[PDB]
Design a protein around this ligand. Structure first.
Ligand SMILES: Nc1ncnc2c1ncn2[C@@H]1O[C@H](COP(=O)(O)OP(=O)(O)OC[C@H]2O[C@@H](O)[C@H](O)[C@@H]2O)[C@@H](O)[C@H]1O
Ligand SMILES: Nc1ncnc2c1ncn2[C@@H]1O[C@H](COP(=O)(O)OP(=O)(O)OC[C@H]2O[C@@H](O)[C@H](O)[C@@H]2O)[C@@H](O)[C@H]1O
Ligand SMILES: Cc1cc2nc3c(=O)[nH]c(=O)nc-3n(C[C@H](O)[C@H](O)[C@H](O)COP(=O)(O)O)c2cc1C
Ligand SMILES: Cc1cc2nc3c(=O)[nH]c(=O)nc-3n(C[C@H](O)[C@H](O)[C@H](O)COP(=O)(O)O)c2cc1C
Ligand code: SF4
Ligand code: SF4
Ligand code: FES
Ligand code: FES
Ligand SMILES: [Cl-]
Ligand code: NA
Ligand code: NA
Lengths: 418, 156, 417, 156
């Protein structure tokens, strides 16, 4: 069962849950999963009503791990208020800069995700589930295909699963190079065989999604929590970390740290602890200048003591931690973020289409020292006006991080003007 | 009158049979075609449309939309080099320089023998291992030119 | 943060074993990877074990732990016996003058680790050990950390790089016994017992750890293996003379200007080691003798011998202790005697009493307190340590001292008269 | 009556879990014990034997055999002085003299405060840097009395 080469990302856990097996950089097959008591959560779940599973997941306080932090139980509840059939979708598009947390679950412990999909699908009455995995994760694709077959053979998928009368097939779809296909409505368009064009929201997918039917989309990491919630009960799960923002969380840490990799930690951990306590501090013991929360936010070195939770003052997002140190040029970094959004706007909305493009094009002129005064003023204006009329979150945030760098590092931008 | 070789047509049909509706298989089909030919032949789209029961322009629009597909350059091995923030900070330019030293090409270029094409790509989701590159489906951290040369020599 | 280690000087004409270890610091896995490290392992895992054995055989690699046994052939002997099999890296290096192995361990641990993984795969061992002497605490901590790095990068554990090959490397520590460098005493120690050598045959490759086929190889031997795979055996055999090919480490100590470890081909002569590489003698004094560790004594008339494993060559581990014209050979012999006295395991009677009496009587001679009978007794004892011995210690405890008696009679007679 | 403190017991148990078989951990355990106490307490041997699932006299024989272990003298720091051929040639006796000047003790003796014990040992595998000594795990070339004195001042 040869898979393509995957770099061996470092992984460390204080909780031994999501990374119990995936802290080891290899495929864990169904017998190893079973030996660790895997699929007993599923068996337990199938002896429960859908309603009660939803209730446990709700009471667990589990929130979306794909960026927005929406309460998962609540999302499920909304779906099942709507007539079937219903569809369950695992979002494995993971394409935001700095973010590599989902793939280690996929590639090392696929049965944890599969088990979560089956439980979740049962909870919402979906008999057809999808994994949409980005095209640039080919090994993940083949690993999941093989794992699904393993699960079929042990009777965890197919018709009348373990005599429950519950039927499920999981189909694995591949992306083909569009970051936007991680946006849940564009993902659905892509599953329907079309271009990845976000739909106006509302309706949310739980009302109208795949083929216009009630659809739950959840992130890989979110789904991976579900077996634990069933296995240990919601009370014990909520005892993990702080009571409000409970449960394990994966933190993909890259840039100027000694130990770049994925860290499974509770969400009371501070950003400072992530970098210095777990990730081994900075390369060359240099001062931290900024942390980029993927391509979403930019924190200064004055903001290191924030909790890695979903609170208003917390780090939020996906817990993606890109560390820049004192010699890293912030304008050069912002250019890379601008370039990302230029490459990934789908172009449906005009301010987004032209704004992402002009933001990158003008910022490159600024960086190279070729910007006119008008180019400077134009850059500022365009950065502030990507969002208007936008129908998805890309347009809403394409200027966000770059604005934060302008506000938090004025002196460094001034150097480029003067 | 372009036709798929039988062995390829079988795999395409298999993707089309995989999902509940045929048209869901479009991206898997296009990956298969690109894997087989080393690019997307413009002639391939018409019979693919037929097999998916879709209009041709639908298929063309999809090929145009998704960045992984290439209708212009045939290449046996695609070297996808990440050019996003983390890889840039950690040494994309070192990797590109090394690639130029060994293969004599820059991003966007194919070697004369049509063996290697360097494709600049967005974040590959392996940022801890920056700077990252792929060779077709295989993915690696770039360590040095000596290391890279050895890796590339595995692709004949 | 590791314990303090003296900064032993290191120099290479070949830039192989000492490519990184010529610099006196720990080289971690990132540095190792930048130099193309672990690519030989990747290449090896694409070969059959049999193929790897054949390459190591054709390389002409010989044991670097003292006895010069052909490494590939040792492996072949192991694999003709049913598994499971074990692989042991011998890092006990405790013979006087010998400090070659430690600089690999302490400065380039991944070279050793990569060698261990390839070798284990070759002989089908899923469990490997490093037995490192207790007096190398830094090397122990360095190896433990390096093994963890290797695990992180997926070079150790189950299904290494999708090969299906499983390996764990355990690091064990000695606790003061030179005899635990003898391969069967080493195994006894790994089994949690006193370091008592076993009667051979059987050799470890037939019956070793837990009675299973076991390959024991020296650190330096193992460190060659990545090169053989990387270069191919034919290119490796181009290094140095075709009958004794490959790089060799020479730990040079005593009365030289530049004491340290030298990586050189084995056609290098003993004179070249001292004068061309190690900078000549302290004070430009004449060479009186070279002790090949505690094994042999070469006179100033024997400096033009090659540093190879030939009958007329230097042999041993290439350990070069230089004595100059003012060094008392009898005083030096006493120190060699003291070593064997302190290290006999005592199982064999002629070794037990002979090692003790050789030292006891030689001290009396040196101090001028020896009777005529003590003199004649010393001579007899020196000739009679070997009988009934079940390991090489008893076989050589009198060897060097006998050579001093033969090559330096005038100095000995000075103590007699 | 004798029990290992939990801090030590935990480390011992870690060594015992490390190798496939418990009894292989015997030397690592005994090192750990000597590290903790500054010697091997005779009382410690029975509970260790239990932990290793070995007979007591087996453990006692192992302690007796291996020269690094010391059941006689408690010492915070062990100054191991090489007395083998190369260090002897290059000035072991100068080192011993300097040690006597600074500490007031000879080989085999412990300072009155229990702080330092001089232990004569065979070749330490650092012969190029003769004459060699260790202070616990740290290892050094002796250069002179003033130098030795500075080194020893670091151990408190
Ligand atoms: N009223 C609602 N009813 C039902 N479902 C809802 C509702 N509100 C939100 N949801 C669901 O919660 C999830 C998150 O919704 P949004 O807040 O709209 O977030 P989205 O635009 O999907 O993601 C934005 C995120 O991506 C990144 O740019 C960044 O991390 C940002 O936080 C989706 O699955 C969405 O359908
Ligand atoms: N017939 C054989 N079959 C299999 N393996 C063998 C055989 N003969 C030797 N070996 C192996 O070759 C290696 C060398 O064996 P010996 O010649 O018995 O030497 P040994 O006693 O291990 O070491 C002696 C060495 O130590 C020093 O005193 C000095 O340098 C001397 O040369 C060992 O690993 C041994 O198992
Ligand atoms: C442009 C854009 C890209 C996104 N990419 C991803 C992605 O790769 N993976 C993901 O799970 N969610 C991604 N999301 C969020 C999804 O739209 C959605 O909120 C999420 O999949 C819901 O699952 P969760 O509630 O478990 O987080 C993205 C959102 C936007 C606006
Ligand atoms: C008394 C004695 C001590 C030995 N000490 C060592 C030692 O410290 N290291 C070593 O590798 N071999 C030592 N040997 C040789 C080993 O028994 C064995 O031959 C060697 O480890 C095999 O590895 P090689 O073939 O790679 O040399 C010693 C032999 C004897 C007789
Ligand atoms: S906001 Fe941008 S990415 Fe989102 S739908 Fe509109 S054009 Fe496409
Ligand atoms: S020859 Fe000496 S060292 Fe070897 S087993 Fe016999 S007594 Fe022990
Ligand atoms: S930025 Fe290159 S892999 Fe993420
Ligand atoms: S003789 Fe003292 S360290 Fe070797
Ligand atoms: Cl046991
Ligand atoms: Na119920
Ligand atoms: Na071959």
């Amino acid at each position: 069962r040869s898979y393509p080469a995957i770099p061996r990302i470092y992984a460390e856990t204080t909780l031994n849950m999501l990374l119990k097996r995936a802290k080891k950089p290899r495929v864990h097959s169904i017998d190893e999963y079973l030996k660790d008591g895997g699929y007993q959560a599923l068996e337990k779940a199938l002896n429960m009503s859908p309603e009660e599973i939803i209730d446990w997941v709700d009471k667990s306080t589990l929130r979306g791990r794909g960026g927005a932090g929406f309460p998962t139980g609540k999302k499920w509840k909304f779906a099942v208020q709507n007539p079937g059939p219903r569809y369950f979708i695992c979002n494995a598009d993971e394409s935001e800069p700095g973010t590599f947390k989902d793939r280690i679950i996929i590639e090392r412990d696929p049965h944890l995700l599969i088990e979560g999909i089956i439980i979740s699908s049962y909870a919402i009455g979906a008999n057809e589930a999808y994994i949409y995995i980005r095209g640039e994760y080919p090994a993940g694709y083949y690993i999941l295909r093989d794992a699904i077959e393993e699960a079929k053979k042990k009777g965890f998928l197919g018709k009348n699963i373990l005599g429950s009368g519950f039927d499920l097939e999981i189909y694995v779809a591949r992306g083909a190079g569009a970051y936007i296909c991680g946006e849940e409505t564009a993902l659905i368009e892509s599953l329907e065989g079309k271009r990845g064009h976000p739909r106006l929201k509302p309706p949310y997918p739980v009302q109208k999604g795949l083929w216009g039917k009630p659809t739950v989309v959840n992130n890989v990491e979110t789904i991976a929590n579900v077996p634990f919630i069933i296995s240990m009960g919601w009370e014990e799960y909520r005892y993990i970390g702080p009571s409000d923002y409970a449960g394990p969380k994966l933190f993909p840490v890259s840039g100027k740290v000694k130990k770049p990799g994925v860290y499974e930690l509770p969400m009371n951990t501070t950003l400072r602890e992530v970098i210095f306590k777990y990730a081994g501090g900075t390369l060359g013991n240099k001062k931290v200048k900024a942390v980029f929360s993927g391509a979403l936010d930019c924190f200064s070195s004055e903001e290191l003591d924030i909790p890695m939770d979903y609170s208003p003052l917390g780090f939020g997002g996906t817990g993606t931690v890109i560390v820049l140190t004192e010699e890293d040029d912030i304008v050069e970094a912002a250019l890379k973020i601008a370039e990302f959004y230029e490459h990934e706007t789908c172009g449906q909305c005009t301010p987004c289409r032209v704004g992402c493009y002009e933001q990158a094009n003008l910022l490159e002129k600024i960086y190279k020292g070729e910007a006119t005064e008008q180019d400077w003023e134009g850059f500022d204006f365009v950065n502030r006006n990507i969002q208007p009329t936008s129908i998805c979150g890309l347009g809403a945030v394409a200027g966000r991080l770059i604005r934060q760098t302008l506000e938090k590092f004025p002196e460094e931008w001034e150097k480029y003007r003067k | 009158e372009f036709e798929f070789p039988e062995e390829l047509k079988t795999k395409l049909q298999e993707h089309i049979n995989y999902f509940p509706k045929k048209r869901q298989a479009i991206l898997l089909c296009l990956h298969e075609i690109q894997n087989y030919y080393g690019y997307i032949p413009p002639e391939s789209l018409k019979p693919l449309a037929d097999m998916l029961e879709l209009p041709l322009n639908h298929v063309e629009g999809v090929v145009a939309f998704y960045d992984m597909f290439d209708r212009e350059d045939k290449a046996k091995y695609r070297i996808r080099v990440c050019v996003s923030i983390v890889c840039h900070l950690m040494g994309t330019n070192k990797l590109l320089k090394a690639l130029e030293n060994i293969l004599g090409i820059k991003p966007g270029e194919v070697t004369p023998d049509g063996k290697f094409k360097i494709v600049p790509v967005q974040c590959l989701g392996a940022c801890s291992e920056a700077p990252v590159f792929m060779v077709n489906d295989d993915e690696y951290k770039f360590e040095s030119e000596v290391q890279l040369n050895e890796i590339l020599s595995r692709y004949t």
